[PDB]
Amino acid sequence: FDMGGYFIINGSEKVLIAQERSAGNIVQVFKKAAPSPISHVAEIRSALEKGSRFISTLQVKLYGREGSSARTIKATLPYIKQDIPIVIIFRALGIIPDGEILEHICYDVNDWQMLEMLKPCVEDGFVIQDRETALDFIGRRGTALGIKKEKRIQYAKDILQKEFLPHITQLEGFESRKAFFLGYMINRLLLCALDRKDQDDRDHFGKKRLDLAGPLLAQLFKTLFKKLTKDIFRYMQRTVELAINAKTITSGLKYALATGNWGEQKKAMSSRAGVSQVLNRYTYSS
Amino acid sequence: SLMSCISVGTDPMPIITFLSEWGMEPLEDYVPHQSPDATRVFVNGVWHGVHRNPARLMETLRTLRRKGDINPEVSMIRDIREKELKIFTDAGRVYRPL
């Protein structure tokens, strides 16, 4: 009758409790409250399926309140302090003339209502007029800064490549793919702002993923396998000219599954506890 | 619930390959004012491009899964109103048989 689906860690029956989470790579609009400068926000929690897993989140913000003069759209970029006006990002992506920028956001040449809302953004991003001066403007605002003209322009390049909208591509030449998506976010932002679509339900089960025993283990294993990688480097360096610690993998797995503390290690909090528990055996149904 | 399961996590590539070979304009080539009402296609919140006749496309993808060719744990939705076709190869999605 015993079903399995549990582990045996130091003689005890440990269960990995399924952990709920908000799904990644999903565009959602939320009306930011009454006493805020920002009125609406387009969020996207973008992470790679596997590969260090970047928890970098893009915030496309609609500044100004309902009935306030000059409502501008600014975006917060990973490893960039200030909120960049959308236009500059498009220009930094190579999409230089307003109208070609407007083509990416508003899909209908008829819809004047949405376009009237985009006029201020154009007015904001007017100062920057080429791809070069756009990457310098983003490069100027760090990070910190990292003073040197050639340096800052060279950076914003990397941030947009590696950090900005990291799903889709982390690769080089994909400026068009990323720019059409940014436009899709701004479209989804204004659709909600013009009372055409609803504010996203942060309580919809479809926008939630339950991490089971497998992925939970993978998160732990990756943390540990990369910890073995740094030890391999330490032995290779010391060998100024086959002893690679198997304990680290065994112990770490054994630790987390035993303690329920889904982290590293006896030096836990903030890590994640209560994940692994002892299997109830009062009743078969229990 | 007794009938519920969780998506194990499949590979997107055979679907991405399939979509392009079934009438999909790549986002790089898209021109919003030329092809206007083209239903925009997504595979795990990654915009891959557009398709001019989604009615045909939705039917081909639906019948691929129903036959077994597309993995059965893969979810695909067609919002006609918003003009979107979203597909999920994603791991962690709770599903139920019907």
């Binding site: 596997k50 590969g51 260090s52 089971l212 025993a213 497998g214 992925p215 283990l217 993978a218 294993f221 990756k222 396998f225 990369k226 990688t229 391999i232 480097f233 290779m236 | 969780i6 194990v8 996590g9 791991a91």
Partner: peptide, 30 residues
Amino acid sequence: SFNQFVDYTLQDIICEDSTLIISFGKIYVT
């Protein structure tokens, strides 16, 4: 979920950024 981890996911983690100035081939589970 566990089976998916052992059969597939384990081989992914083993060689995603593995290689060191020493690379890692196929993984075997006893």
